[PDB]
Design a protein around this nucleic acid. Structure first.
Lengths: 94, 271, 46
RNA sequence: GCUCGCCGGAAGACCAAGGGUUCCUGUCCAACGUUAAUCGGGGCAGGGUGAGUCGACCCCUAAGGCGAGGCCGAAAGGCGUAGUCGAUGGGAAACAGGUUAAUAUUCCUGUACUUGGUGUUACUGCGAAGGGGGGACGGAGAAGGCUAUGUUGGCCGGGCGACGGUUGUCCCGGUUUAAGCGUGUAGGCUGGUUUUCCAGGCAAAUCCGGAAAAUCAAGGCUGAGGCGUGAUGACGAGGCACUACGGUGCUGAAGCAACAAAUGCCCUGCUUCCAGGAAAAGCCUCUAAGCAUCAGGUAACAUCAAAUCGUACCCCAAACCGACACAGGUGGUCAGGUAGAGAAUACCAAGGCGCUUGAGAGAACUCGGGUGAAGGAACUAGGCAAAAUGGUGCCGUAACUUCGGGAGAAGGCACGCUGAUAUGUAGGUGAGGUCCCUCGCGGAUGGAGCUGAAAUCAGUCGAAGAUACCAGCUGGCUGCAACUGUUUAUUAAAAACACAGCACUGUGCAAACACGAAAGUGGACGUAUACGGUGUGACGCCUGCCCGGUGCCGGAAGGUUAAU
RNA sequence: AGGACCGAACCGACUAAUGUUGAAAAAUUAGCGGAUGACUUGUGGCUGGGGGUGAAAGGCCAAUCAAACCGGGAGAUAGCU
């Protein structure tokens, strides 16, 4: 049983995009931004407990940070994890 | 049986094969095979310690019984086999209790023959007895140097030794090199010569035949440069020095044996 | 023409990597020299 | 958007290696692009990489690395046992269709499969750090059965022609369907089953191996493909409509047969040869300690789990390696049509490009080519370079020879198209119909239909029929080297090096020798028919005289001679 | 069957031309040799400088080889410019 406070730290932010909205309205899958070290079980448990929704399966991928250029200095954005949480049929989420 | 190949191409023009119709035309015995990895003539420091070795066809080691300690239990010869690890052929023999082993093949050994080791074995080709019970003058092979260590002398294709004398605890053998050597009377030996006597009659024909046996080419010293070999150098063909190894020791006649520990067993040097 | 640098990350790490340097005394001395000099990237490793 | 040209065994498509957001969208032209630039692999911002089945991680080892103790070494350290890493090799499982601007065997739909826990029922000798089997292995060659794939016919939808003809032996397009499950076929291997005994597999074993005895010729293992199912589904040429002209939505016919055929599969097979062709684990089985009605094992069902990391994009290149958006270099996979023996070569399909300065003019001269009167090497160090020969079948072919060659020697004849033999032949493939059968993916007869060289006779066009690209110039004497190879990456490919063969010499195994202050290791798990060094270099005829000099081998009586 | 024959991929570089501040710090075009073997290639490993490796040219050892490269003795020495 994964701890509650750990669940309270797994989810970072909802990912907002055209593909995300399309997935939400067509495949009942929400795209969330999660912690880089989170496992599928932790993400599933965190969504099921904190949002009170039934999760079918979780798909994750690691997004590489882009190498940007602030003026003349070359810098790199932070890597982040992205999770496709597929809610069960009939469920609704904000 | 030696056969001469027809000259249908250079490299085959001079080939003389040595066919043996009795050899097994199949795969060797699996419980007795084991790995034999090549080295390239390189030691554990990775340096070439002996040149002209490398490449060649892959080979597996056949566990040949050299000690020959199964005493009193007769064995029948299942089949003769080719062995890439040595010049002589080997024979797969089956003991009465169901254990199979590999032995060197004698001169007259055919499928179905019976062999036996021990002190009370009969005196016939292929049997192994300690040489104090073996009659003087007989030619034997796969002979031990220390009691129970296994054969070390007379192991190639068509070699043998003659037991020429026996005096107390030691016997005197006339080795294949023409040298008389003493050895303890408790060492075992197998009666009769070893089989593939015509192996020396074959001619390889081409350079690739020697390449297949992991023998890289040999460069003559006079063809090199002075930094590489003592013989190197010269505008043309020049060899104005006494022949020596690449490390400066003379080759044409100079003796190099320096083992005072075993001098007591050499009754008379080779000729 | 085949140039002298044919890259391979596996060979790169196995030849000049941090663990390869720390395996022997001389590599650690190289690391010590670079740490004294203040190099940003100690070894070839990414 | 319409024409033109180029690649098409690549200049197309997908990966590994390497790169690391160069991918897609909006926006900008200061700097980068050898020119302009609204465009970009350029700047800025946003988006994009979804896995129980693909790959890595994991279990297992090769070469090799590190190496508890250990041996050796002034110190640092070297080698190495038990172990433990190290893929480039062994080990469990997923396919088809649709969708995004950018991902898809990952998302969705339909249909599966594998390995582990737990939990109920039924059955009962379980258990390895040990034993056996298996994994498990070479080169070449020859058929036979297939498939990917292609051609043709039939079927379905559309068309009746910008210019003579085109309702027909006409034209265009489509005719596609997987994993899995069942069947076990063409074909490959092996005689099966039961009982008794045993110095072997470090002990045991019912397992493997070895001896007998009885019984039955028919049992077992492996196996492409086909067929049925998966599939009343998907896809499908096109129609019906909107539209931001980008695309989106709805509906949907035929969806068969014959022939040719792989380098792919059966095939890790078969035949044959010597140069004699990894290891370990997963998997099956056997028992030793131990566990005694417990634990465990295998069968069904249910349930749970399969985590983590990579997934965009280039990948024969403008993104990798070459300082460049570089005429160079880069491993694996797919392999369509016609002609052709062919992955050569020419033109095309699917697909992708026109190589990031153009426009004129048509001088000398330079580069890459085309043609040439008369002569044909007179050029030149030299036929250097150009020019010429070039395919298949057949006739014919010399000296010399190690009898294999030389040899495609040289030299010559025929070659297109049409008809007849034969409205398409010999050959190949093979349906209905009949018969037998241990009955099925069976066998004999039988020839429909399809495909299809080669030859003879007659005729016909051009100067020319191997009409193009492709594709030996030939012969004579001779030096050197036997030959195929190798070599100075970047001015030398040779007569130089190497080579099989010959000879001498060292070496009796804890071998000589070599790398090592040493341990040790190679030689070699080889043993004088072997291994190392030196010279010579296939084969034929041979290798003659000299030990004075310098080496080497044998001898130790005498002279001389060190440390002590 | 063959270090057999003709000839693509692949490996190599014999002859000529161009290019020599090149498209290229050795390549392009037309020819050429091997093309089942002493072949060629991918991945990983081993041999270290008086050392390695060499079918042997003093060749090659990161565009550098009759003794690599980097740091140090080191501002070597220089009757020479």
């Amino acid at each position: 049983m994964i701890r509650e406070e750990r669940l309270l730290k797994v989810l970072r932010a909802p990912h907002v995009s055209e593909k995300a909205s399309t997935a939400m309205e067509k495949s009942n899958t929400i795209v969330l931004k999660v912690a880089k070290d989170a496992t599928k079980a932790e993400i599933k448990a965190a969504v099921q407990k904190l949002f009170e929704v039934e999760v079918e399966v979780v798909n994750t991928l690691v997004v590489k940070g882009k190498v940007k250029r602030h003026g003349q200095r070359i810098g790199r954005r932070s890597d982040w994890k992205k999770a496709y949480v597929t809610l069960k049929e009939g469920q609704n989420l904000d | 049986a030696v056969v001469k190949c027809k000259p249908t191409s250079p490299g085959r023009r001079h080939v003389v094969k040595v066919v043996n119709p009795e050899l097994h035309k199949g795969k060797p015995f699996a419980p007795l095979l084991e790995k034999n990895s090549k080295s390239g003539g390189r030691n554990n420091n990775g340096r070439i310690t002996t040149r002209h070795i490398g490449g060649g066809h892959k080979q597996a080691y056949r566990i040949v019984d050299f000690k020959r300690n199964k005493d009193g239990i007769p064995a029948v010869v299942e089949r003769l086999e080719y062995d890439p690890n040595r010049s002589a052929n080997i024979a797969l023999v089956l003991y009465k209790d169901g254990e199979r082993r590999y032995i060197l093949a004698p001169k007259g050994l055919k499928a179905g023959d019976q062999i036996q080791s021990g002190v009370d074995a009969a005196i016939k080709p292929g049997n192994t007895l300690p040489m104090r019970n073996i009659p003087v003058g007989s030619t034997v092979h796969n002979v031990e140097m220390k009691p129970g260590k296994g054969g070390q002398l007379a192991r190639s294709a068509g070699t043998y030794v003659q037991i020429v004398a026996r005096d107390g605890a030691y016997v005197t053998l006339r080795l294949r090199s023409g040298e008389m050597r003493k050895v303890e009377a408790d060492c075992r030996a197998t009666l009769g010569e070893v089989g593939n006597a015509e192996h020396m009659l074959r001619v390889l024909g081409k350079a690739g035949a020697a390449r297949w046996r992991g023998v890289r080419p040999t460069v003559r010293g006079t063809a090199m440069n002075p930094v590489d070999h003592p013989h190197g150098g010269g505008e043309g063909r020049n060899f104005g020095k006494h022949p020596v190894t690449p490390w400066g020791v003379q080759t044409k006649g100079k003796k190099t044996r320096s083992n005072k520990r075993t001098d007591k067993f050499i009754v008379r040097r080779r000729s | 023409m085949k140039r002298t640098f044919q890259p391979s990350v596996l060979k790169r790490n196995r030849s000049h990597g941090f663990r390869a340097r720390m395996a022997t005394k001389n590599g650690r001395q190289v690391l010590a020299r670079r740490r004294a000099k203040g190099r940003a990237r100690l070894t070839v490793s990414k």
